[PDB]
Structure formats: C-alpha cells, structure tokens
Nucleic acid binder design. Structure first.
Ligand SMILES: [Ca+2]
Ligand SMILES: [Ca+2]
Lengths: 220, 215
DNA sequence: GACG
DNA sequence: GACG
C-alpha cells in the first residue's frame, strides 16, 4: 500500500473553457466525497440496474468565472459561457475558493483520494494550474489522486471498447448517462461506474493512489 | 424595499434528529445558491428547469444524539451510521466551510427555507450558537417560502409536497434527502419567479434576529 | 399549521 | 485516446 488505506473517495469533475492545448480555465467544479464503506455497502436484474448512490455523501458544486472566453465546443458541451457566468455574478477561481475546498476536504476521513475520468491528463493537471495562480498554499498537498480510466480498464479486463465516461457507462448499464452538461452530472455518472465493482475498485485505488502534489501543472 | 434587492437566493434544507419539541440536531444540510438574474405556462406548467448556473453544498453531519425512530425512517440517516462513515459534528471547520461558500455569493444574500421561520432558521441558529467562532450568517437575510406562496397563489395545505403537486400535478422527486427537499423548494419558487423575487426583497429580514430553537 |  |  503506497500510502495506506484511503477512507474517502472524492469523485471530481471540472468543466472548462476548452481542451488542454488551449490553456483552459475552470468554469465549474464538482466534488462528491464518499467514505469507502458507503462504496462497499449485489446487483440484480437485466440489464444490470444503475446502482443507488450511497445515502451518506458530501457534495460541492461551484460555478466559476474564467478569465478568458469559453471555446465554442466547451460552451456547447457545458451550457456555460463566460458572459453568463459574469451576468449571474460568478467569481474567478480565487483564494476563498481554495479555503472552501480546504474546509470541505478537512471534513472527510483521512486519507482522501480524488478520482476523475482522464484525471491524470485533464482534471488533476488543470486543477494544479488553477491553484498555482493563487497566493495561498495548495489544499491538496496531502490529498491523493488516481485516474478512473486506468481503473476500469484494469477492472473489466479482470472480467475494442472506448473508455470515455459515457461509453463505459452504457457498456455497464445499457442506459445513456442522465446528465452530460454539468460537473455534477459527470460526477454522478463517474460514481455509478465506480459502483460497478466497488470492492475491486477500492483495492485498485488503495494501491495506485499517488500524491496530488506530484501532478504536474497543465500550463505555467 | 427594506434591505434593497437580494442578489442571491440560497435555498436551504435541514435534516435532523426530530421535530422541534425533541430539541433536534442537524444531520444533513443542503444549500443551493441562485443569482437573482437566474430567476428574473400553462395549465399545468411543466416543472421549471433548475437554472444552469448554481452553487450547491450538501453535507452529512454527525449529531450529538440519536435520531428519533421517525426521523431515521424518513431521512435514511442514523447517528450510528453517520459515525460509521466518519462524519464530523456541526463544528468550527463547518462554519469556515459555510462562510466561504456564502462569500462566493453576491451580497446581499437571502436564505429561503420552507417553514424555515418555525424550523430551519431557528434550528440553524441553535446549531451555530453552539460554536466558538462568530456566526458566518450574521450578515445574511432570510425568508420563509410558506408565506411567499400563500401570497403568490392568487384553505389547502402549504406543506412542501402539497404546493408542488397542486402546481405541477406531480409528486416531488425526492422526499428523503436534504438535496431532494431543496430541489422541490426550488421548483416551487420558480413557478412565479418575478413575483417570488418581489416578495423576497420586501420581506427579507436579518438572520441575526432569528431566535434559537432552544438552548 | 408544519418542520424531522 | 480522452478531457472541454
Ligand atoms: Ca471530465
Ligand atoms: Ca424541510
């Protein structure tokens, strides 16, 4: 066990202004914190039902004004735009936001592990970049992270498929994901797939977790 | 009139150990913050769409005492299980969390809760008074959604589910979680949004003046 | 009433 | 890929 046992899985999703090469800026952030026990506590039916979210969960979802415009594809994919976020008086990614995250993370049983779909290549690096702009320390220096793409690959294989979020979900449950437009929608889809084999999901997390502090920024 | 235009409405629901006479404690809290521009037919109207741009908080909270049998049934929460999954009490750090969430909202902000004048507002105040640090809410306003809807409806029940079903002809989606209750409340308040805002602005009062439920 |  |  690299860093022992993670008592909390925090499912994470960021919506943003664009894809990596565009030096994107977060526009929406969702966190769903789950005690590992909530994720242990058998599917019946065909096709296999979408699992019940555990009762005990902490949830945080925030809209964030970016400093640059949303690319057309981001804006269509999210239903968000820079002008709208300002009209609705959203604030930039700031130190206060970091305090909010800090306090939220602190409310969870340590050690905590962030889980995001393609997180090692998207969410984690971009979140690293956002916090670096800030005049405060990172609230995640003690937090851990793993990528759920590598997780379900090593899970299905235990027994030419895409491993995009929506593809894995429709593979498993034969339904379209309920919400594809919001950060929370992405996190709930992520949670359902991660509930497919909770037992083994956890085992794999506990052994592949790595310090968030070792994630390299998306851009400088 | 009295405190200017509210810029943020925060929809609030508390799950707890019991009804007021049991001197209950919070077991779950949900905040849903919506800018006033997000608000500002027919027969029945469909259930309104929640605005795209929202801030949302939902936390489970370990109470100091057991849930009454009745509260456990309708909330799916128990002290034992909240403890098994390592929830923290209503503590100082929760206040820090709450304060940061709130200061991400454009002021002035108004708390909106259903029967909030008799239940959520005094219960929250009782919870907050218990802490060492100052209340992160003393700058905030509040209003009860029950009166609002009595006023906006032009003898029958004004419970959450009753208004909702009289308006949209459907049962609420989720009556078992704080988030569920907040969403039902939001739909209710989205029925006549401008009229609702109207009534909130006029009736907003300081949350500093809300009397603790007990203690 | 109506709130857990 | 796969993330917006
Ligand atoms: Ca994503
Ligand atoms: Ca309530």
């Amino acid at each position: 066990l690299p860093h022992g046992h993670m008592q909390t899985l925090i499912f994470l999703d960021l919506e943003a202004t664009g894809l990596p090469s565009s030096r994107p800026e977060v526009t929406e952030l969702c966190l769903l914190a789950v005690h590992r026990r909530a994720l242990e506590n058998i599917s019946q039916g065909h096709p296999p039902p979408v699992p019940r979210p555990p009762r005990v969960v902490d949830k945080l979802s925030l809209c964030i004004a970016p400093g640059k415009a949303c690319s057309p594809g981001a804006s269509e994919i999210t239903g968000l735009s820079k002008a709208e976020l300002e009209v609705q008086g959203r604030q930039r990614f700031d130190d206060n936001l970091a305090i909010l995250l800090r306090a939220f993370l602190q409310r969870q049983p340590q050690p905590c592990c962030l889980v995001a779909h393609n997180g090692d290549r998207y969410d984690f690096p971009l979140l690293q970049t956002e916090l670096a702009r800030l005049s405060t320390p990172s609230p995640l220096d003690g937090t851990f992270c793993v990528d759920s793409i590598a997780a379900l690959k090593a899970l299905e294989q235990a027994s030419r498929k895409s491993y995009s979020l929506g593809s894995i979900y429709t593979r498993l449950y034969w339904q379209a994901p309920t919400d594809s437009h919001t950060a929370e929608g992405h996190v709930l889809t992520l949670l359902s797939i991660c509930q497919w084999k909770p037992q083994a999901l956890l085992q794999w997390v506990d052994e592949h977790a790595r310090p968030f502090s070792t994630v390299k920024p998306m851009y400088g």
